[PDB]
């Protein structure tokens, strides 16, 4: 069972990801890893630090060992916060000393803030904000590298995502491949495929950034090359369905996510709703996705296409009222980043997640404890559905 956590408060030490039950052999390095990171830090509009890889484990010369990976990223600005954030004990009254150390107490709407104060009894906000925070995506997508790399490498799958919207841009229509991840990628400002949604994205972003507010908006991330009967139908939690909603919706700020025409799909009619089969050339062929890669939860070999709604995750500056919890007065929410947006990244985040999920899929149907014997069943399974 693939399996991953993450640690990490966004201004402590580093973030860890640990990534278990990854197969041996699987080619992976540093360098895979910041890549994704790097990717993580795309796109105009963004807040948002150097994220320094250091692999602890699991991983030698490039192959991962089969025991857990760890994968500690930096937090580049750490001197800054090895007081309010030392894990040891600090002298409250030279701690009383320290701006930064000063408590945080004015929740932000939209945030852990008041929910988590409440939840750990903290007086603070700090210990909530500091797990809570989006920093911890960065360890997800080290987590994520490595999912991808044995996506690519065992099923020759691939994994990427593109903006559709942004903030109330006309959302867009058809997925990218492979092939555009470079511009869609990095390229986009907004990582949108499309030209025409490009601009209107950008445009909202502008004009968000001039009235100072902050936007959400609506990302795909698309998985190509899957083979068919990854997931299953055997428990609701079994379905890939369930399994992708529950990583992508656990990205901070996902209120929504749908697999393939999701929501537009419930307004349809059956008759026009799925994604009819005619014989191939060499197996089942449709001509409509609206699935988006699963039927009964299971992929059909159509693109995976998993669809999150980000709300607003920056704080707007002035505007959100909320209760100090020290005082019991009003008060208004200080912000906390300053992204306008960060769909786009999301994007990549949402990448991670849907990466890390096939991958347990994959290794939960193929199992094998290294790249290459989940190769032969793979492939055994191929042949033998190409039979028929």
């Known amino acids: 069972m693939l399996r991953w956590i993450t640690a990490g408060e966004s201004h402590g030490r580093a973030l860890v990801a640990v990534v278990e039950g990854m197969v041996a052999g699987v080619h992976v390095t540093s360098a895979d890893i910041a890549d994704q990171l790097a990717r993580r830090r795309l796109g105009y509009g963004r807040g948002a630090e150097r994220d320094a890889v250091t692999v602890l484990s699991g991983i030698r010369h490039g192959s991962t060992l089969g025991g857990p990976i760890a994968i500690e990223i930096g937090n580049t600005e750490w001197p800054k916060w090895e007081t309010v954030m030392a894990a040891d004990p600090v002298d409250p009254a030279e701690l009383a000393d320290v701006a930064r150390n000063a408590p945080l107490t004015r929740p932000r709407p939209g945030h852990a803030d008041y929910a988590g104060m409440l939840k750990y009894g903290f007086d603070d906000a700090r210990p909530v904000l500091e797990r809570a925070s989006a920093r911890e995506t960065a360890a997800r997508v080290a987590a994520g590298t490595v999912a991808r790399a044995f996506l690519r490498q065992a099923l020759g799958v691939e994994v990427l995502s593109h903006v559709i919207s942004i903030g109330a841009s006309a959302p ?162 200080i912000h906390q980043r300053s992204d306008v947006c960060a769909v786009p990244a999301a994007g990549v985040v949402v990448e991670t997640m849907v990466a890390l999920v096939l991958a347990r899929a994959a290794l939960e149907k193929f199992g094998g404890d290294s790249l290459a014997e989940t190769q032969r069943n793979i492939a055994a399974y191929q042949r033998s559905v190409a039979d028929r």
Do not use: C
């Open 172 to 333: 867009y229509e058809g997925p990218p491949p492979r092939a555009e991840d470079l511009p869609a990628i990095d390229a986009s400002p907004v990582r949108a495929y499309d030209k025409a949604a490009e601009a209107d994205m950008i445009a909202q972003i502008e004009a968000a950034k001039k009235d100072g507010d902050t936007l959400g908006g609506v990302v795909e991330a698309v998985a190509l090359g899957l083979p068919v009967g990854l997931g299953s139908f055997t428990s609701g939690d079994h379905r890939l369905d369930s399994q992708l909603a529950a990583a992508v919706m656990g990205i901070q700020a996902i209120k929504g996510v749908e697999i393939g025409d999701g929501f537009q799909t419930a307004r349809r009619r059956g008759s026009r709703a799925h994604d009819e089969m005619y014989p191939g050339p060499d197996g089942v062929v449709r001509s409509t996705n609206r699935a988006g890669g699963l039927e009964g939860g299971m992929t059909n070999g159509q693109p995976l296409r998993v669809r999150a709604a980000m709300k607003p995750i920056s704080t707007v500056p002035r505007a959100l009222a909320t209760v100090d919890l020290a005082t019991g007065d009003e008060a208004v929410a």
